Amino acid sequence: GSSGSSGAPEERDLTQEQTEKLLQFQDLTGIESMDQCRHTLEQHNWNIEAAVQDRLNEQEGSGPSSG
């Protein structure tokens, strides 16, 4: 909006690979807050496969299990 950035004088840039992964997860999951996304990822260790599960597992829209 109008100069409203609360944080520290730091900068964290991701890598192409990682970035891409995010895009995927983001789309898959559907989270808005990018951070939130990378979060679930970082945790699982940028493991969409897991992050995805940990994402769904923890409160899902519709469909607890598939197959």
Please report, for the chain, the start and end positions of each structural domain, with discontinuous segments joined by +.
1-67
Method: NMR
CB-CB contact of 25 with 40 (8 Å) = yes
Q: 42: closest CA among 12, 2, 67, 7?
A: 12
Compute the distance between CA of residue 30 and CA of residue 58 in angstroms, rounded to an integer.
14
Contacts of 43 (CB under 8 A, 6+ apart): 51, 54
Cα dihedral sign, 34-50-12-59: positive
Q: What are the phi and psi torsion angles at 32 (to 5°)?
A: -90, -60
b/e string for 20-33 if b means 16 or more Cβ within 10 A? ebbeebbeebebee
- Cα angle for residues 8, 14, 15 (degrees, 5° grid): 160
CB neighbourhood size of 49 (10 A): 9
In whole angstroms, give the CA distance from residue 13 to residue 26: 17
Query: Residue 28 in contact with residue 56, Cβ under 8 Å?
Result: no
**What is the CATH code of the structural domain delimited by 1-67?**
1.10.8.10
